[PDB]
Amino acid sequence: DEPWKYLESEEYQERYGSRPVWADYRRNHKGGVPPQRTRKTCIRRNKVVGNPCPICRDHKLHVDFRNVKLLEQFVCAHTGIIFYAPYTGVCVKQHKRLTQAIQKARDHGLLIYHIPQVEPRDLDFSTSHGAVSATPPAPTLVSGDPWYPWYNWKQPPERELSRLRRLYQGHLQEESGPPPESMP
């Protein structure tokens, strides 16, 4: 179950050698150009297809982020690009799993890849901006008056209230009421 043992064991160098795993698979197709996709899976239900892919033909070959020699076998050596499924021979499912293993090993550190030297994001590196320093506080904020004092409820005189009632009587709704202050 735990990988990194078969790859250093004896049966690997007996069946395969210094050659890669995929150096023996030839996909069967209508001749000339192969289809520009492999099968989606070799293992349908719990049965294997007639010509298994290099990953699917050996159940011992487990794939994860710690299986670094397989991962560097399935990624190129002179270029930092991953081998595609028509090039290698693995399924679409196995290609997705091998890719996820590649980037999981890449951000877990157990795989070699090139990182370019990056130029600094900005030119001026000062922190003397109003967005990255303090600001002179508002008069309301040094006090506690609400900003834009027309936000506060202020009851009109009942003369204006009765003028409103004279305008919009008949279909008049219920009465007034000041806001509470603190939510539950």
Partner RNA sequence: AUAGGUUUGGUCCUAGCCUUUCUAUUAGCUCUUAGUAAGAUUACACAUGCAAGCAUCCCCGUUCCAGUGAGUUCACCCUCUAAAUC
Q: Minimum distance between the CB of residue 102 and another protein, rounded to whole angstroms?
A: 14
Q: Which residues pair with 43 in a beta bridge?
A: 48
Based on CB atoms, which residue is closest to another protein, 46 or 128?
128
Binding residues for another protein, total number by CB under 8 A: 75
Which residue lies nearer to RNA by CB, 114 or 166? Answer: 166
- Range 134-173, binding RNA (CB under 7 A): 167
Binding mask 131-150 for another protein (x = CB under 8 A): xxxxxx-xx-x----xxx-x
Pairwise CA distance, residues 28 & 121, whole Å: 51
Q: What is the DSSP string of 34-69?
A: PPSS--S-SEETTEE-SS--TTTT-TT---STT-HH
Contacted by 32, from RNA, another protein, Zn ion, none: CB < 5 to 8 Å by type: RNA
Q: What angle do CA 32, 34, 39 make, to 5 degrees?
A: 155
Task: Kindly state the tokens that stand for 89.
Answer: 């021979």
Report the site for Zn ion in 55-114 (rule: CB under 5 A): 56, 91
